UniProtKB/Swiss-Prot annotation:
It comes from the Eukaryota. Coiled coil: none annotated. Keywords: Acetylation, Cytoplasm, Nucleus, Ribonucleoprotein, Ribosomal protein. InterPro entries: Ribosomal_eL30-like_sf, Ribosomal_eL8/eL30/eS12/Gad45, Ribosomal_eS12, Ribosomal_eS12_CS. PROSITE patterns: RIBOSOMAL_S12E. One of its GO terms (cellular component) is cytosolic ribosome. One of its GO terms (biological process) is positive regulation of canonical Wnt signaling pathway. Part of the small subunit (SSU) processome, first precursor of the small eukaryotic ribosomal subunit. During the assembly of the SSU processome in the nucleolus, many ribosome biogenesis factors, an RNA chaperone and ribosomal proteins associate with the nascent pre-rRNA and work in concert to generate RNA folding, modifications, rearrangements and cleavage as well as targeted degradation of pre-ribosomal RNA by the RNA exosome. Subunit of the 40S ribosomal complex. This is Small ribosomal subunit protein eS12. Belongs to the eukaryotic ribosomal protein eS12 family. The modification N6-succinyllysine is found at residue 111. It comes from Homo sapiens (Human).
Amino acid sequence: VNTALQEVLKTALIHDGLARGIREAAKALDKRQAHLCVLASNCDEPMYVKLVEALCAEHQINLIKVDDNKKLGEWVGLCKIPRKVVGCSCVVVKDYGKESQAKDVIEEYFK
RNA sequence: ACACGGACAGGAUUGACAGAUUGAUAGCUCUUUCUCGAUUCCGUGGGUGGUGGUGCAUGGCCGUUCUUAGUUGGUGGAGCGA
């Protein structure tokens, strides 16, 4: 179910909890402070970015996958609702709020 | 300053060491290539700022006629009337 991206990300932007972007993801992985990693599977061909795929096998990070760039850019960050299209490709969530329905679905996804 | 659109987390873009530059220890810019991460940059519209004009569009205030001793109603008289 997709409330593992609806109930954590929209409640996570309000708390200085997003590290959105790609080089900031590399500096956040070297901080050892990645707790939640939303990848991309949308690319020109996906073999061009292998750094966030391999630095978690050095750094023991949880990974949750998605297949989309534009619905990723509609999950997190800003947009007009002639429309301001930006697209996000990798998300490090650094911090959270206090949640009682959605701690587990980001927590227990270790398969 | 805002709004429309271009841009844009495959990064809008702020800061910056040495070296040319300069009168300069102005990342000013050019060489050079790191930091930052949607406040920000591109053209429009509209604005803002002015100890810039016109005291001959004006107020406020001040000088001067004048600190000389002048100025005006009401009822009554004069005049059709000023």
